[PDB]
Amino acid sequence: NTKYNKEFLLYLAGFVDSDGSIIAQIKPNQSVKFKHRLQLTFDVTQKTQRRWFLDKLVDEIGVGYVADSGSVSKYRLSEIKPLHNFLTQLQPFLKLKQKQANLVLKIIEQLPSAKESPDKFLEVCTWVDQIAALNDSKTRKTTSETVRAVLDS
Amino acid sequence: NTKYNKEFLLYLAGFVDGDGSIIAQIKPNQSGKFKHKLSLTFKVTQKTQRRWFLDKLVDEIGVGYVYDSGSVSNYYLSEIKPLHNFLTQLQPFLKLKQKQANLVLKIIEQLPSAKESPDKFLEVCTWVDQVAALNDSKTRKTTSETVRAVLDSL
DNA sequence: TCAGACTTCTCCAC
DNA sequence: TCTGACTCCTGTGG
DNA sequence: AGGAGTCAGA
DNA sequence: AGAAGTCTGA
Ligand SMILES: [Mg+2]
Ligand SMILES: [Mg+2]
Ligand SMILES: [Mg+2]
């Protein structure tokens, strides 16, 4: 539980509300109990020419990783435990994606209890929809109603 | 001069480094002293769906205007005097765009003296090229060399 | 003349 | 099984 | 920016 | 994001 500087969070929040992205998605997984897995993500996009800025962020945050894919580099953070602790400090300074942050945190806290009953799993899948709704959902496929069709078995 | 909150300057600097922009232009102006007008500009582009965010900027900064462009809205600030005061306070928090900001402030200070001899005017025009080079210039047309050709003709 | 108010354009960086 | 590191793709919003 | 995938070690 | 412009009034 590394604590982050307030002035660091303020700048970062402004950068996140601009080029950052708080994603929460459902992926097919035939090896899990409900044939679907959850994926919470903290993304910060920037062009590869300025990938160094993303590298500096891996150190300041501590955990996380930067990937390249063409003329664009991406800082990711999918690891649950540090993600919850990170957003919990970042959230009060967001002005655009603040709603997405509180939703992701709520999912993370209700993550173990959502592996027991299918209805509790569907409820979380609903919370996932409430995040893509706020975002610019363009290429989203697997939703909560997708699970419902498969869950009926 | 207006003083801004550090908390506001910290958040905004990140947003400026993210989706904001810092421009320096040399516009053709036949009714000008040297057939050209200098227009320094600080802008924050954002989706019109989130225009309210740009509307708050006008109140928080105290100046500037917000216009549309289809699905794109822009908060511009070209008024030289409050611009100089704003970028002076925003610069220490800029990371990706601190170099451009200090160059704008550098131009503004030497602006009335630039209207003297063309050689002093052209030096400032070269300082505009520096700002453009730092930015991801794609559709730039008028540079200092455009001015040089015109003034060497008269 | 001039300087601020308003719009149009276009690609790549998200 | 279940998590995280890793790549790839699309379409506007800068 | 917002997703869609894949794959291996644990 | 980063330019290209027009148009008023003082
Ligand atoms: Mg943005
Ligand atoms: Mg940017
Ligand atoms: Mg952007």
Domain range list for chain A: 1-153
Residue of B20, B53, B93 with shortest CB distance to A11: B93
Calculate helix-pair angle for B98-109, B80-90, nearest 10 degrees: 140
* Catalytic (active site) residue B18: yes
Which residues 6+ apart lie within 8 Å of B153 measured at CB? Answer: none
Residue A27, H or E segment: strand A20-28
Q: How far is the CA of B82 from the C1' of F10 (A)?
A: 20
Q: Considering B17, B19, B55, B136, which one is annotated as catalytic?
A: B19
Q: Which of B7, B17, B137 to mutate to test the interface with A (most CBs of A within 10 A)?
A: B17
The residues that bridge with B37 in the sheet, in sequence order, are B27
CATH class label, A1-153: alpha beta
- Supply A6's token pair: 């307030």
Residue ranges of the alpha helices (H) in chain A? 6-19, 52-61, 80-90, 98-109, 118-132, 144-151
The CATH fold assigned to B1-154 is Endonuclease I-creI (3.10.28)
CA distance linking residue B14 with residue B91, whole number of Å:
11
CB B41 within 8 A of CB B76: yes
Q: Obtained via which technique?
A: X-ray
Q: Which ligand is nearest to the CA of A47?
A: 2
